[PDB]
C-alpha cells in the first residue's frame, strides 16, 4: 500500500496474532515452540512433496 517499511519479524508475528483475537502476550513467551513447530511443518511438507 505504498513504500516498504522495515519491521522486525517478531513484532510482525505479534500483530498477526493480535489480529485474530489472541493477545500478543502469548507470542513473546512461547517463541521457541512456535519456531520449532514451523520448522518441523516445513520439513514435513518438503518431504511430502
Amino acid at each position: 500500500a505504498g513504500a516498504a517499511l522495515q519491521i522486525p519479524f517478531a513484532m510482525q508475528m505479534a500483530y498477526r496474532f493480535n489480529g485474530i483475537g489472541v493477545t500478543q502476550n502469548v507470542l513473546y513467551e512461547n517463541q521457541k515452540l512456535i519456531a520449532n513447530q514451523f520448522n518441523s511443518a516445513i520439513g514435513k511438507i518438503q518431504d511430502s512433496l
Binding site: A1, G2, A3, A10, M11, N25, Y28, Q31
Partner: protein, 109 residues
C-alpha cells in the same frame, strides 16, 4: 476491509458515474509518506514485572521511550493505563529496562 479490492491502499470512499456502456468508479485512498527511523522494543521491564502496550508500539528517539500508534507518529508518555502487565520478565527476548509513571501516587500527595 479486503486489501486492493477497490483502490491501491487503504480505502475511504467511492463514487459511481455512468458511461455509454459501463460504469466508472472514483476511489479515494489514503497513503502514508515522509517516514523516519526509530528503535523499538517488545516489552518494558520495571519493578520485576513486564509491561506490554495495549494497542501500539514502543519507540525511542535515543534518550527517552514513548508509545505510539502504528500508522502515525504521535508520541505519548508511558503510563500504567495504556500498558498492561503480564507475568514477570525472565523469558521474553528483547527486554529493556525503564520506568513507568503512574498518576495515582502523585495525585494522592
Amino acid at each position: 476491509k479486503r486489501v486492493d479490492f477497490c483502490g491501491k491502499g487503504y480505502h475511504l470512499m467511492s463514487f459511481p458515474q455512468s458511461a455509454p456502456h459501463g460504469v466508472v468508479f472514483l476511489h479515494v485512498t489514503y497513503v502514508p509518506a515522509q517516514e523516519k527511523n526509530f528503535t523499538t522494543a517488545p516489552a518494558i521491564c520495571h519493578d520485576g514485572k513486564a509491561h506490554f502496550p495495549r494497542e501500539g508500539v514502543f519507540v525511542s528517539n535515543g534518550t527517552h521511550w514513548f508509545v505510539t500508534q502504528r500508522n502515525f507518529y504521535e508520541p505519548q508518555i508511558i503510563t500504567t493505563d495504556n500498558t498492561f502487565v503480564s507475568g514477570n520478565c525472565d523469558v521474553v527476548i528483547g527486554i529493556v529496562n525503564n520506568t513507568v509513571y503512574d498518576p495515582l501516587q502523585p495525585e494522592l500527595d
